[PDB]
Amino acid sequence: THVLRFGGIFEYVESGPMGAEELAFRFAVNTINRNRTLLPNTTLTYDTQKINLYDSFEASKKACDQLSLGVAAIFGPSHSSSANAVQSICNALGVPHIQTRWKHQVSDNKDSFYVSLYPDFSSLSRAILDLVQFFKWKTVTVVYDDSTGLIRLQELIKAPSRYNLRLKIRQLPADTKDAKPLLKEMKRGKEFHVIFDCSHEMAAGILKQALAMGMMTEYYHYIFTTLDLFALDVEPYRYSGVNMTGFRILNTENTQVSSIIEKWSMERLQAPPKPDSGLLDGFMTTDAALMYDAVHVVSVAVQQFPQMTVSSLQCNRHKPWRFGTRFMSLIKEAHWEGLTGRITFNKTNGLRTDFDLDVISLKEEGLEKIGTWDPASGLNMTESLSNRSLIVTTILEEPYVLFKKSDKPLYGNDRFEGYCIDLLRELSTILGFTYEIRLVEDGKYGAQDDVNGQWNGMVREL
Amino acid sequence: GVAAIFGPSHSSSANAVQSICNALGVPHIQTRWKHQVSDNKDSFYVSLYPDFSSLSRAILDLVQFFKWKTVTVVYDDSTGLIRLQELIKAPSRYNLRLKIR
Numbered sequence: 423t424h425v426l427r428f429g430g431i432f433e434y435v436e437s438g439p440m441g442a443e444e445l446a447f448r449f450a451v452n453t454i455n456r457n458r459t460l461l462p463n464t465t466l467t468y469d470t471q472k473i474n475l476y477d478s479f480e481a482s483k484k485a486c487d488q489l490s491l492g493v494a495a496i497f498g499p500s501h502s503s504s505a506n507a508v509q510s511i512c513n514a515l516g517v518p519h520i521q522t523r524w525k526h527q528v529s530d531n532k533d534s535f536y537v538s539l540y541p542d543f544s545s546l547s548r549a550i551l552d553l554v555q556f557f558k559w560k561t562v563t564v565v566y567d568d569s570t571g572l573i574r575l576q577e578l579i580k581a582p583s584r585y586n587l588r589l590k591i592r593q594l595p596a597d598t599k600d601a602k603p604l605l606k607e608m609k610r611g612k613e614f615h616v617i618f619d620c621s622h623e624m625a626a627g628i629l630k631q632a633l634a635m636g637m638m639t640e641y642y643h644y645i646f647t648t649l650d651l652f653a654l655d656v657e658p659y660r661y662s663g664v665n666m667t668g669f670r671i672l673n674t675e676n677t678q679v680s681s682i683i684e685k686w687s688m689e690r691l692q693a694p695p696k697p698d699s700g701l702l703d704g705f706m707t708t709d710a711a712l713m714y715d716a717v718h719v720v721s722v723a724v725q726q727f728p729q730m731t732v733s734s735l736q737c738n739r740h741k742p743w744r745f746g747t748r749f750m751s752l753i754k755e756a757h758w759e760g761l762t763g764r765i766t767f768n769k770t771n772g773l774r775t776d777f778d779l780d781v782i783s784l785k786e787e788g789l790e791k792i793g794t795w796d797p798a799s800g801l802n803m804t805e806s807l808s809n810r811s812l813i814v815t816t817i818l819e820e821p822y823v824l825f826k827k828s829d830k831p832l833y834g835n836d837r838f839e840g841y842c843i844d845l846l847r848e849l850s851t852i853l854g855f856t857y858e859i860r861l862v863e864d865g866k867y868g869a870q871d872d873v874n875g876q877w878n879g880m881v882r883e884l
Numbered sequence: 885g886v887a888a889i890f891g892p893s894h895s896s897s898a899n900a901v902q903s904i905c906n907a908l909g910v911p912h913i914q915t916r917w918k919h920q921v922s923d924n925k926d927s928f929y930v931s932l933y934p935d936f937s938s939l940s941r942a943i944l945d946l947v948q949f950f951k952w953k954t955v956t957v958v959y960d961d962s963t964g965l966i967r968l969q970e971l972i973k974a975p976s977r978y979n980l981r982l983k984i985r
């Protein structure tokens with residue numbers, strides 16, 4: 423059988439023996455060759471190196487060392503800076519490159535030897551806009567971890583030009599977790615709708631600090647554009663009363679996906695996640711799922727490309743790789759499906775813009791799925807009585823409605839008294855009424871506001 | 885035989901050359917604005933283009949001095965919003981009506 427090794431450049435760490443992306447790559451590599459369903463007459467192999475993800479020169483060195491040997495494909499690092507150098511090297515030598523974590527793509531860079539399994543942030547931003555349209559919001563507060571968040575989410579920022587929205591963008595300071603000034607500023611603006619554009623670890627941390635600030639009220643609504651929001655411990659938030667909504671691509675509601683996540687949680691028993699950090703345990707991180715799907719679709723493409731003789735392309739001198747064109751084409755229209763649901767590549771760019779999304783909202787139960795988002799269909803939100811309570815609202819005027827003048831605190835509908843109260847009593851004893859008296863929360867009459875026509879009291883209560 | 889480097893005027897190319905120069909120790913004296921990743925730990929380099937933090941807040945100073953109420957920012961491509969961050973965050977602390985196009 424054919425033997426091919428996929429050049430891998432993953433994170434170098436010292437606390438954990440090997441990085442989660444490295445675990446995903448190794449697991450999928452040993453799974454594909456083991457399972458004769460994929461690659462029956464071809465044996466898998468790999469070549470994993472370690473970089474700091476910032477010294478792009480050393481990443482280039484590792485990539486050059488890999489290409490000096492036979493490499494089937496390059497699975498570039500998950501950094502927003504070093505990946506550019508690796509993809510440039512791959513394009514120069516005509517070798518396929520498969521990113522997994524999103525990076526900014528220079529619109530003036532004409533490189534056709536790279537793909538990005540991470541859903542394109544333009545599509546995700548459009549989905550966020552569609553969801554906010556479904557929520558009819560007016561005041562929003564977008565927050566980002568890195569400055570790249572502005573690039574990641576721009577469609578919603580432009581939206582107030584298209585629609586009647588309003589934005590107030592604030593930044594999470596670096597090298598700190600002091601969200602308290604940011605949250606205090608949020609209260610000073612009464613920004614009940616807030617969007618958190620940060621990774622799931624930072625999202626969980628800032629959620630913990632918000633709960634410690636008592637930000638889990640019903641009035642506050644949260645959206646987390648990250649795809650690992652499901653992996654947060656919603657146990658303190660199951661009864662917090664938040665209407666939080668989020669997105670998901672890991673199609674956990676599948677037998678094969680459940681088996682894979684269970685096996686992966688079994689494998690990662692060496693470095694358990696810290697329980698006292700607001701993070702769940704035994705779950706598939708979205709980046710690992712993307713790496714899994716990326717290597718699987720590469721395997722699917724090379725299934726249709728049996729002639730996969732590798733070479734020893736150098737960096738001291740450059741030479742085009744003869745198998746790049748058609749193999750990368752097969753990569754581009756490799757329509758395989760896995761943990762992230764549907765996987766396909768927009769042939770115009772290579773960034774996946776057509777992908778399933780699990781719309782996730784928070785209720786009493788933990789992170790229910792309230793529908794599905796698709797690029798073609800936009801947002802797909804689908805989801806008298808004899809013993810009917812007769813709720814009424816009334817204002818306390820002594821000639822009309824006065825509380826029962828009893829020293830003992832009276833309960834039930836008997837505590838209410840007056841002309842209107844007894845008139846309602848007569849209506850209930852004449853007609854069929856399950857009468858109950860509820861005091862008006864506004865305490866004032868319906869006033870025609872010149873600002874927005876906002877009523878109050880009985881009018882806006884009805 | 886070199887003792888200094890003047891990198892290209894571009895994000896990715898200058899980033900790569902800066903990393904190479906840091907590894908080799910020679911300075912990489914870039915002359916064009918680029919977005920350094922906030923967690924970058926490189927030293928041997930310097931940029932002369934006015935960083936869009938003092939210049940962005942200078943645009944903010946112009947906005948306040950002109951006393952605008954309805955500002956409509958317009959940019960060129962993705963790496964422009966990441967560059968005028970202070971102007972984007974200004975409406976939180978003041979009265980602005982950014983409708984970005």
Ligand SMILES: *[C@@H]1O[C@H](CO)[C@@H](O)[C@H](O)[C@H]1NC(C)=O
Binds near residue numbers: 799805
């Ligand atoms: C939308 O979701 C519903 C179930 O929630 C499903 O029956 C339907 O096929 C989906 N698509 C469309 C276009 O309605």
